[PDB]
């Protein structure tokens, strides 16, 4: 697979969304972990482009898993690592000089060095990236200030070039900490704080692993398959709060809440969910309908199809049917089913692309 970047290359029409990363290599990393990104075109700083268009990192997707390559000045393009057998760490220990990475500034303190600012961002529950003013900054009001920042996506909204100031990334992803990701588990409890996203999960331990990898989730609430309201069954509510803790614990049955251990054991085990869910149909956008022998073959079909996020093998069972059954390869936007269905005789699972 391709890990080397394509210099002065611009991919054309796969735009999923556009986010701002320091470099093209980080643009790749963001692409790699995006549920749908296959390709990217990064716009490096050059006089041929207007400053606002700098550090543009465009996440792309294509049914054909590739896109037209046009040549263009100061454009670095490349491919995701979804298929690749080599791995990356997603940990940006680099500190970027003369770079203002912008987001929602929520903290503004003082720090001896950028490394003290970094350690603050790393240890702060909400911090995604930081910007630190060196001692030589024009404004004496701002000298030696540490701005803790967070964004919806975990990546900056806009990056500009500002002299005598350094930006960097939280190093929560650099920890090891084999320890339980779900940490505090609150059975027969619903939380009720800002819901920032929602996905459909088969069990409550997928729910937790998602919250741990989600940029802005600190605690969660999972409604089970036996939860009263059908629309809410298997609903994984990702929540956050200004404190970082829940506010109120409402004791309702058939719902399980919990706490993310943000830096636990979670580079790629939510991606290594090699579990098979029997009598379970992961709904989504249909990508193909291939035929195969086992669900273990269906899985290998989903892993090798780079656009496949999850699968449902509908087993044929040779009671009176053929031995070969149907392998629905599927996808969605979040990377999770749009609805989990119980009782329709399918064996479901998750792609092993990033495992």
């Amino acid at each position: 697979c391709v890990t080397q970047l394509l210099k002065d290359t611009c991919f054309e029409g796969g735009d999923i969304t556009t986010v701002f990363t320091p470099s093209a290599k980080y643009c790749q990393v963001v692409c790699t972990y995006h549920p749908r990104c296959l390709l990217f075109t990064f716009t490096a700083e050059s006089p041929s482009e207007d400053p606002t268009r700098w550090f543009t990192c465009v996440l792309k997707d294509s049914v054909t898993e590739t896109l037209p390559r046009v040549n263009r000045t100061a454009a670095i393009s490349g491919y995701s690592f979804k298929q690749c057998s080599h791995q990356i760490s997603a940990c940006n220990k680099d500190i970027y000089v003369d770079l203002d990475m912008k987001g929602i500034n929520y903290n503004s303190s003082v720090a001896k060095s950028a490394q003290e600012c970094q350690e603050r961002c790393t240890d702060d529950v909400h911090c995604h990236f930081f910007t630190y003013a060196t001692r030589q900054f024009p404004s004496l009001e701002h000298r030696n200030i540490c701005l803790l920042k967070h964004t919806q996506t975990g990546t900056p909204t806009r990056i500009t070039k500002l002299d005598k100031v350094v930006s960097g990334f939280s190093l929560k992803s650099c920890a090891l900490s084999n320890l339980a990701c779900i940490r505090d588990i609150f059975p027969n409890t619903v939380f009720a704080d800002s819901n920032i996203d929602s996905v459909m999960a088969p069990d409550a331990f997928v729910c937790g692993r998602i919250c741990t990898h989600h940029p802005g989730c600190l605690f969660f609430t999972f409604f089970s398959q036996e939860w009263p309201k059908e629309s809410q069954r298997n609903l994984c509510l990702l929540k956050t709060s200004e404190s970082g803790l829940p506010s109120t614990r409402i004791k309702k049955s058939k719902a399980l809440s919990g706490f993310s251990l943000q830096s636990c054991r979670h580079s790629i085990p939510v991606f290594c969910h090699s579990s098979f869910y029997h009598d379970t149909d992961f709904l989504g956008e249909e990508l193909d309908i291939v035929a195969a022998k086992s669900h273990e073959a269906c899985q290998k079909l989903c892993t090798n199809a780079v656009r496949c996020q999850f699968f449902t093998y509908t087993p044929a069972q040779a009671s009176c049917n053929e031995g070969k059954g149907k392998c629905y390869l599927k996808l969605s936007s979040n990377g999770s089913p749009t609805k989990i269905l119980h009782g329709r005789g399918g064996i479901s699972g998750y792609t092993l692309r990033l495992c």
Binding site: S139, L147, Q232
Partner: peptide
Amino acid sequence: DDDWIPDIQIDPNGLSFNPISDFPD
């Protein structure tokens, strides 16, 4: 065990904060 009304309305949006200004040039 006595009554369940659906009074948890899933609502996706962000966490608020106190505004802090950027560096000027």
